[PDB]
Amino acid sequence: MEPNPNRQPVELNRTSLYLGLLLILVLALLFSSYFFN
Amino acid sequence: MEVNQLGLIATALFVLVPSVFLIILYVQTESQQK
């Protein structure tokens, strides 16, 4: 099929990875207590 | 302690799913041409 020209590559740099993992892990450390209740 | 027995899976998926999303995006970023 004729290719779609609206396609764009996606990126996540290392600093962004680290920031995201920090956000997620710290959120988990915060909410886990409430999930266990 | 009488904790919620679903707290473990809730926490585990809460950590793992977005963490995995991010690792997928990072790694596929690194492997792109320099």
Partner: peptide, 30 residues
């Protein structure tokens, strides 16, 4: 199992500190 979870998450965070510091993408002047 709760304790295991909490300590696990904490340890993951500390390891994350380690990688974020010593294995960061280096800042480069262009």
């Amino acid at each position: 199992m709760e304790t295991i979870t909490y300590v696990f998450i904490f340890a993951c965070i500390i390891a994350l500190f380690f990688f974020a510091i010593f294995f960061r993408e280096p800042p480069r002047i262009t």
